[PDB]
Design an enzyme around this catalytic site. Structure first.
Site, mmCIF file in Angstrom:
data_model
loop_
_atom_site.group_PDB
_atom_site.id
_atom_site.type_symbol
_atom_site.label_atom_id
_atom_site.label_comp_id
_atom_site.label_asym_id
_atom_site.label_seq_id
_atom_site.Cartn_x
_atom_site.Cartn_y
_atom_site.Cartn_z
ATOM 1 N N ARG B 38 0.856 -1.182 0.000
ATOM 2 C CA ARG B 38 0.000 0.000 0.000
ATOM 3 C C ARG B 38 0.894 1.233 0.000
ATOM 4 O O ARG B 38 1.765 1.371 0.852
ATOM 5 C CB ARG B 38 -0.951 0.005 1.185
ATOM 6 C CG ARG B 38 -1.832 1.242 1.332
ATOM 7 C CD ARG B 38 -2.679 1.162 2.638
ATOM 8 N NE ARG B 38 -3.338 2.419 2.935
ATOM 9 C CZ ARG B 38 -2.972 3.233 3.915
ATOM 10 N NH1 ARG B 38 -1.989 2.894 4.730
ATOM 11 N NH2 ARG B 38 -3.589 4.384 4.084
ATOM 12 N N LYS B 220 -12.901 2.610 0.721
ATOM 13 C CA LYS B 220 -12.705 2.595 2.166
ATOM 14 C C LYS B 220 -14.015 3.031 2.826
ATOM 15 O O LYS B 220 -14.650 4.007 2.390
ATOM 16 C CB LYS B 220 -11.535 3.497 2.575
ATOM 17 C CG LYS B 220 -10.232 3.215 1.776
ATOM 18 C CD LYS B 220 -8.900 3.719 2.450
ATOM 19 C CE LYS B 220 -8.810 5.189 2.466
ATOM 20 N NZ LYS B 220 -7.855 5.707 3.473
#
Lengths: 382, 473
Positions: B38, B220
């Site tokens: 990430r 998210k």
């Protein structure tokens, strides 16, 4: 909002420097602590007696049974004996102090539970701390002999791989529930709160996942005994259970673990009192219990409806503080079914579970007054 | 060894940063157990990311494994203005005003320099400030003034962040900075792109229009609006992250776990890879070993059947990033291979849709169990069949053979997918032969073991899965 609590999991809170005065103990209890753990590794019998008297003081102020768990240090090292000479002394002190529960550390096999129970001589029920590789291999024997269980993860992940604890925890909770032994999950549940006033996301998950496993108890150790924020730690435990138990997905997960009935009258009436309560929409299941056995069997079924465990023996009421959902209430001896029904309705109304006209399921033994005689389910109106 | 196969099916997402950036470091984490890297676009410059990206991609030659890069876009950064003394104390029940006057603030007043709040905030709505430490409630609002009552007091210092949990605000989830970071991510060929500040399905649609199918989209889930809109957002997205850090600010922290249960369930039933993030091994920012709560947290995500488990500062900024990554690998290896695992995964039902691919995903899994198959080899042109089989969470390990390098990277976020880039095949026999030689080359099968092959008969064509075939290796 002290009783009822609005959740059925039991919060176990360790006392120590940060939580030891009468005012401090009172405050944890109002903030959500249900069972106080006194650790005998350290400090003196002099200081425990003051702490005990300060826990018991609370019975007079709030009319509720307290629950004290004396933790024997065991053969801490800094093939060997279950109870050291220090433990045998601390035990005799704990029984002087009318311990509701005694816990034993570092058990490795069933014979160590036996040694302890033979010394204790029925004066107090025994909880076993499982923290040694041998204890896990000897799990079925140990769990059979014990009265209650602690998944003591701190030491368990020292002597076993720490990645082995979760599956071992699932195993202990499952089997404890199936055997009907109260089980407490322990260590670092809110560790960050030793220093911070709020928990980490991983810590809240751990508590919720102990609840979803259906455990009787979740413990704080240094978060209440030695930390900078003991009141917030205790209260966060209460806040997590209040929310999780009343959020969607709770009972489905609790029901994952099958807890079928032994071939007994008490287990049959426990299961079918629960089901009957669901079917008729009862506001509560009221269990008359001389020694607590029946209340434990109903608790094992994990009913949706609230339990009230009505006992005449102030020591049983204290001990039941550790049993999932038990809600003990010391009462007078009743002598007829009529008297039991009226006492059951009035108790459910007084603590707010029902109002006149609501259904109640009563589990009892008739003719009344004797232990192990449970044989009635009675559906009554409050 | 310990790299591929990893001995476990859950995927590790590790955030890169100061503690894990150099070539040697990035290589270390890969070996240690990290599967998806990430890259957070909120800090740093493109020039440095480009170095990191190249360092991730260099792993592919060393190890003959496809890598996977998730680019996380910051979204809006809502902050109050500044105060004359740098801070103030807010006393419970006082009046506190938010306006558009840049004048330095005081105990009554501060600039709220975000016009969009003034278009949506109304009476009863809260503002949370300093990570939810302070709560104020709007008693009065106008297009240019927001008047609040302080419900939860505390210090309030210069340009603290705030949150708007109770009402959707007319502000795009992709900021100008994000749009530019997105173009950089796509030019760098992001395998996955992560959207922040999601409130409504329109935010996902908007993001996918900008992306024009150049990388799949992870959303998210941070905000109460998005949980209210969960179904429409889950449907539109390609992947999910349970972004617990912001969820536990915008909602009660004690409400995250039931909301995580819900998100992970629906993500599996919809076939959308789901990642659990935030503070999973947080104490390892400073310590070389985790707490018991933390290890329980990782294991409970695995038992939910989530596709992924993520580290943020534990690998990005902490003192023990190698031990932290490795610990994720150790928990997954032990829990998935210990008793009690498959039963907990199977608690979430994931029934077949009425499609040939879903029926065959199920048939293959059930067939593998009955015949004792060692692997389930899935042929896939875009990754779709791999997901649907992954979705059934079979006991037998999956090998996802695709001709396409980009598909092989992206599948690195799919539970147990085990992507291998291979040559195209043109007949069933070519597929069986390639399937057996792949299962043997990586250690899953020896000559004579049974395998289940899932494929499509017009070979080379996406969407055609129609065959289950039991073969010997």
């Amino acid at each position: 909002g002290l009783f009822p609590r609005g959740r059925k999991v039991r919060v176990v809170s360790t006392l120590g420097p940060a939580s030891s005065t009468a005012e401090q103990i009172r405050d944890r209890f109002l903030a959500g602590a249900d069972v106080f753990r006194i650790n005998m590794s350290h400090g003196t019998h002099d200081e425990k007696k003051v702490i005990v008297d300060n826990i018991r003081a609370l019975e007079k102020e709030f009319n509720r049974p307290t629950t004290i768990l004396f933790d024997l240090q065991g053969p801490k090292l800094r093939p060997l004996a279950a109870l050291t000479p220090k433990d045998r002394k601390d035990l005799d002190f704990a029984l002087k102090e009318k311990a509701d529960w005694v816990a034993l550390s570092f058990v490795q096999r069933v014979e160590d539970v036996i040694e302890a129970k033979e010394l204790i001589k029925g004066r107090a029920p025994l909880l076993v701390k499982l923290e040694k590789p041998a204890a896990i291999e000897n799990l079925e024997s140990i769990l059979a002999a014990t009265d209650a269980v602690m998944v003591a993860r701190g030491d368990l992940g020292v002597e076993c791989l720490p990645e082995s604890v979760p599956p071992t925890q699932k195993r202990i909770v499952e089997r404890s529930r199936q055997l009907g032994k109260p089980v407490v999950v322990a260590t670092a549940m809110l560790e960050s709160m030793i220093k911070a006033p709020a928990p980490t996301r991983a810590e809240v998950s751990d508590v919720a996942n102990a609840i979803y496993e259906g455990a009787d108890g979740i413990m704080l150790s240094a978060e209440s005994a030695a930390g900078d924020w003991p009141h917030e730690a205790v209260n966060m435990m209460h806040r997590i259970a209040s929310y999780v138990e009343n959020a969607p997905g709770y009972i489905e997960r609790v029901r994952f673990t099958p807890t079928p009935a032994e071939p007994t009258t008490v287990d049959a009436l426990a299961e079918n009192a629960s089901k009957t309560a669901e079917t008729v929409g009862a506001k509560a299941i009221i269990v008359f219990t001389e020694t607590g056995k029946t209340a434990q069997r109903v608790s094992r079924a994990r009913p949706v409806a609230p339990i009230l465990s009505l006992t005449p023996d102030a020591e049983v009421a204290r001990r039941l503080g550790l049993v999932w959902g038990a809600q003990p209430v010391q009462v007078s001896t009743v002598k007829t079914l009529d008297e039991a029904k009226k006492l059951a309705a009035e108790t459910a109304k007084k603590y707010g579970f029902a109002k006149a006209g609501d259904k109640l399921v009563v589990v009892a033994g008739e003719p009344f007054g004797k232990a192990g005689t449970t044989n009635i389910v009675d559906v009554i109106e409050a």
